[PDB]
Amino acid sequence: PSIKLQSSDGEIFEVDVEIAKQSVTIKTMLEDDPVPLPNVNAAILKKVIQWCTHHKDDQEFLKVDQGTLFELILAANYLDIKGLLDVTCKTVANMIKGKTPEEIRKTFNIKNDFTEEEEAQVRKENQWC
Amino acid sequence: EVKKWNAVALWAWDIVVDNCAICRNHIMDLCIECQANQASATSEECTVAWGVCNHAFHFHCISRWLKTRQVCPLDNREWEFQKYGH
Amino acid sequence: YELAINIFQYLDRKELGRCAQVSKTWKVIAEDEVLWYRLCQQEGHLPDSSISDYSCWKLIFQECRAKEHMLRTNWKNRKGAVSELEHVPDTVLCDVHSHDGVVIAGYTSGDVRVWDTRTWDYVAPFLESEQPNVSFVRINSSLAVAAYEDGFLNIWDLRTGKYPVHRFEHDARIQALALSQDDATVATASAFDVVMLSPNEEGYWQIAAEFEVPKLVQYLEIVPETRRYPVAVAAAGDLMYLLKAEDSARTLLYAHGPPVTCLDVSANQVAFGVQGLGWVYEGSKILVYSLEAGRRLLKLGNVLRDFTCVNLSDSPPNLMVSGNMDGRVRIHDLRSGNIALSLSAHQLRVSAVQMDDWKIVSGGEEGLVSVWDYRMNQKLWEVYSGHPVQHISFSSHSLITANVPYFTTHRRHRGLIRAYEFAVDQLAFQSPLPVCRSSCDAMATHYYDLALAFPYN
Amino acid sequence: LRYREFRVPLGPGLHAYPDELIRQRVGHDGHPEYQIRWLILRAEHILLWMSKDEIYANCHKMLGEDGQVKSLIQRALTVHVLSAYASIEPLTGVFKDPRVLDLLMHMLSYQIRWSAGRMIQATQILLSLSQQEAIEKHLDFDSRCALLALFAQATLSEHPMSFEGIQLPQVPGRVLFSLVKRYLHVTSLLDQLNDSGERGQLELEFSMAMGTLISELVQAMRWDAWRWRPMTELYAVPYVLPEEHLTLAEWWELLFFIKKLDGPDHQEVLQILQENLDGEILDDEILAELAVPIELAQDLLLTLPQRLNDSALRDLINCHVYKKYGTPLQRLVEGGKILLDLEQALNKVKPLLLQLQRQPQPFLALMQSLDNRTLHLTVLRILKQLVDFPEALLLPWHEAVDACMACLRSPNTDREVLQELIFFLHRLTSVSRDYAVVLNQLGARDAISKALEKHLGKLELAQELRDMVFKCEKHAHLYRKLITNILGGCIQMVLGQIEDHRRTHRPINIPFFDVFLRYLCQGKCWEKVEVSSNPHRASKLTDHNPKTYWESNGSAGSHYITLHMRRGILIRQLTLLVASEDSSYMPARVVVCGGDSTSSLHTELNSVNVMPSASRVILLENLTRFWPIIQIRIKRCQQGGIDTRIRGLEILGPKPTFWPVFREQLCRHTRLFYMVRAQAWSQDMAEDRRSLLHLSSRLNGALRQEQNFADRFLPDDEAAQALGKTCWEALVSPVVQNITSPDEDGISPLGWLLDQYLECQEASRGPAFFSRVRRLTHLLVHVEPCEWSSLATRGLPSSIMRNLTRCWRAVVEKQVNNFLTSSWRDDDFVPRYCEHFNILQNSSSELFGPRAAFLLALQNGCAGALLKLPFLKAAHVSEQFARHIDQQIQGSRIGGAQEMERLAQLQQCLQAVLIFSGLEIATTFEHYYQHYMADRLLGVVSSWLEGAVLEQIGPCFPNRLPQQMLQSLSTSKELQRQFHVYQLQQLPEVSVLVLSRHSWPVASICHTLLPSYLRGTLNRYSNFYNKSQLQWTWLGWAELQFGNQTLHVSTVQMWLLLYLNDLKAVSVESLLAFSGLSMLNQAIGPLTSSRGPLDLHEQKPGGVLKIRDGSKEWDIVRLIPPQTYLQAEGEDGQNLEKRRNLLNCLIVRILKAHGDEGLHIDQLVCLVLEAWQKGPCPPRGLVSSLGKGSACSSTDVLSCILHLLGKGTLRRHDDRPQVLSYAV
Ligand SMILES: [Zn+2]
Ligand SMILES: [Zn+2]
Ligand SMILES: [Zn+2]
Helix (H), strand (E), coil (C) string for D777-844: HHHHCCCCCCCCHHHHCCCCCCCHHHHHHHHHHHHHHHHHHHHHHHCCCCCCHHHHHHHHHHHHHHHH
Q: How far from B41 is each of B35, D9, D1023, CA to CA, in Å?
A: 13, 51, 53
Q: Which domain holds residue B2?
A: 1-84
d(CA C451, CA C432): 17
Its sign, for the CA torsion C91, C93, C95, C97, is positive
d(CA A49, CA A44): 8
d(CA D1156, CA D1148): 13
The data reach a resolution, in angstroms, of: 2.8
Centre a 10 Å sphere on the Cβ of residue C179 and count the other Cβ atoms it contains.
23
Query: Is residue A33 classed as helix, strand or coil in its secondary structure?
Result: coil
Nearest CA in chain A to C5: A89
Q: Number of C to D CB contacts under 8 A, please give it.
A: 162
C-alpha dihedral, D129 to D132 to D137 to D143, nearest 10°: -10
Which experimental technique did the depositors report for determining this structure? cryo-EM
B23 known ligand binder: yes
DSSP D999: T
d(CA D940, CA D945): 13
- Whether the CB-CB separation of D171 and D478 falls below 8 Å is answered with no
Query: Is residue C432 classed as helix, strand or coil in its secondary structure?
Result: coil
Centre a 10 Å sphere on the Cβ of residue C393 and count the other Cβ atoms it contains.
20
Select from D917, D921, D965, D997 the residue whose CB has the most chain B CBs within 10 Å, as the one to mutate to test that interface: D997
Beta-bridge partners for D563? D529, D630
CA D754 to chain centre: 26
Query: Is residue A88 classed as helix, strand or coil in its secondary structure?
Result: helix
Helix (H), strand (E), coil (C) string for D380-421: HHHHHHHCCCCCHHHCCHHHCCCCHHHHCCCCCCCCHHHHHH
B11 touches chain D (CB under 8 A): yes
d(CA D812, CA D818): 10
d(CA D989, CA D177): 121
Spans of all domains in chain C:
2-76
Q: Which residues are CB-neighbours of D705 under 8 A, at least 6 positions away? A: D502, D505
Taking an 8 Å cut-off on Cβ atoms, the answer to whether B6 and D993 are in contact is yes
Chain A residues within an 8 Å CB radius of C2: 77
Q: Between residues 802 and 861 of chain D, which touch chain C (CB distance below 8 Å)?
A: 841, 845, 849-852
A2 touches chain C (CB under 8 A): no
B53 known ligand binder: yes
B86 known ligand binder: no
Alpha helices in D662-716 (DSSP H): 662-687, 695-713
D111 touches chain B (CB under 8 A): no
Alpha helices in D231-368 (DSSP H): 248-258, 263-276, 283-286, 294-303, 310-318, 328-333, 337-344, 349-358, 361-368
Taking an 8 Å cut-off on Cβ atoms, the answer to whether D1162 and B56 are in contact is yes
B26 known ligand binder: no
Its sign, for the CA torsion C64, C68, C74, C77, is negative
C212 touches chain D (CB under 8 A): no
- Whether the CB-CB separation of D1164 and D1147 falls below 8 Å is answered with yes
Chains C and A touch (3+ CB pairs under 8 A): yes
Query: Is residue A107 classed as helix, strand or coil in its secondary structure?
Result: helix
Residue D1210's identity, in one-letter code, is L
C5 touches chain A (CB under 8 A): no
In degrees, to the nearest 5, what angle opens at C-alpha D1104 toward C-alphas D1098 and D1108?
A: 90
**Do the strands C112-116 and C102-107 form a parallel or antiparallel pair, or are they unpaired?**
antiparallel
Chain D residues within an 8 Å CB radius of B80: 960
- Whether the CB-CB separation of D595 and D549 falls below 8 Å is answered with no
Q: How far from D595 is each of D538, D592, D603, D629, D1046, CA to CA, in Å?
A: 21, 10, 6, 5, 106
C-alpha dihedral, D143 to D149 to D154 to D155, nearest 10°: 130
CA D961 to ligand 1 center in whole angstroms:
26
Its sign, for the CA torsion C438, C439, C443, C444, is positive
d(CA C404, CA C389): 6
DSSP string, chain B: -EEEEEEEEE--------B-TTT-SBSSS--HHHHHSTTSS--TT--EEEBTTS-EEEHHHHHHHHHH-SS-TTT-----B--S--
Helix (H) / strand (E) containing C403: strand C398-403
Q: How far from D340 is each of A62, C272, D333, CA to CA, in Å?
A: 107, 93, 7
The candidate with the shortest Cα–Cα distance to B12, out of D1075, D993, D1027, D1002, is D1002
Chain D residues within an 8 Å CB radius of C300: none
d(CA C205, CA D777): 56
d(CA D662, CA D491): 8
- Whether the CB-CB separation of C218 and C176 falls below 8 Å is answered with yes
Q: What fold, for C2-76?
A: Monooxygenase (1.20.1280)
* List of E strands, D524-654: 526-531, 550-551, 559-565, 573-577, 587-595, 603-609, 616-620, 629-637, 645-646, 648-652
d(CA D1158, CA D1155): 6
- Whether the CB-CB separation of D872 and D1131 falls below 8 Å is answered with no
d(CA D446, CA C407): 74
> Number of structural domains, chain B?
1
Centre a 10 Å sphere on the Cβ of residue D1093 and count the other Cβ atoms it contains.
19
Centre a 10 Å sphere on the Cβ of residue D198 and count the other Cβ atoms it contains.
7
C-alpha dihedral, D539 to D542 to D544 to D549, nearest 10°: 60
Q: Which of A97, A113, A122 sits opposite C20 (nearest CB)?
A: A122
CA C170 to ligand 1 center in whole angstroms:
78
Q: Which of D960, D1042, D1201 sits opposite B52 (nearest CB)?
A: D960
Q: Which of B1, B7, B10 sits opposite D1005 (nearest CB)?
A: B10
D1006 touches chain B (CB under 8 A): no
Chains D and B touch (3+ CB pairs under 8 A): yes
- Whether the CB-CB separation of B14 and B5 falls below 8 Å is answered with no
B77 touches chain D (CB under 8 A): yes
- Whether the CB-CB separation of D821 and C381 falls below 8 Å is answered with no
d(CA C427, CA D217): 47
Taking an 8 Å cut-off on Cβ atoms, the answer to whether C83 and D226 are in contact is yes
d(CA D209, CA D187): 10
CA-based nearest distance A13→chain C, Å: 27
Q: Between residues 94 and 153 of chain C, which touch chain D (CB distance below 8 Å)?
A: 120, 122
Residue C319's identity, in one-letter code, is L
Chain D residues within an 8 Å CB radius of B47: 1160, 1162-1163
d(CA D741, CA D278): 64
d(CA D560, CA D591): 9
Residue D202 zone, left/alpha/beta (φ > 0; ψ -120 to 50; rest): alpha
d(CA D893, CA D903): 13
Chain C residues within an 8 Å CB radius of D621: none
Sheet holding C307-311, edge to edge: C307-311, C319-324, C328-333, C339-344
DSSP string, D223-257: ------EEGGGTT-S-------B--HHHHHHHHHH
Q: Which residues are CB-neighbours of D810 under 8 A, at least 6 positions away? A: D751, D861
In degrees, to the nearest 5, what angle opens at C-alpha D578 toward C-alphas D572 and D579?
A: 150
d(CA D464, CA D449): 12
Q: What's the CATH number where B45 sits? A: 3.30.40.10
Q: How would you label A18-52 residue by residue, b for 16+ Cβ within 10 Å and e otherwise? A: eebbbbeebbeeeeeeeeebeebebebbebbbebb
Query: Is residue D968 classed as helix, strand or coil in its secondary structure?
Result: helix
Chain D residues within an 8 Å CB radius of B13: 996-998
Q: How far from D460 is each of B80, D421, D426, CA to CA, in Å?
A: 101, 9, 9
Chain B residues within an 8 Å CB radius of D1036: 5-8
d(CA A41, CA D1220): 79
Chain C residues within an 8 Å CB radius of A128: 17, 62, 65
Helix (H) / strand (E) containing C154: strand C152-157
The candidate with the shortest Cα–Cα distance to D738, out of D691, D796, D795, is D691
CA-based nearest distance B77→chain D, Å: 9
Give D511-514 contacts, CB < 8 A, sequence gap 24+: D511/D207, D511/D208, D511/D210, D511/D211, D511/D214, D511/D215, D511/D252, D511/D253, D511/D256, D511/D319, D512/D211, D512/D214, D512/D215, D512/D218, D512/D253, D512/D315, D512/D318, D512/D319, D513/D214, D513/D713, D514/D320, D514/D712, D514/D713
CA atoms within 13 A on the CB side of D337: 0
Its sign, for the CA torsion D309, D310, D311, D317, is positive
C292 touches chain D (CB under 8 A): no
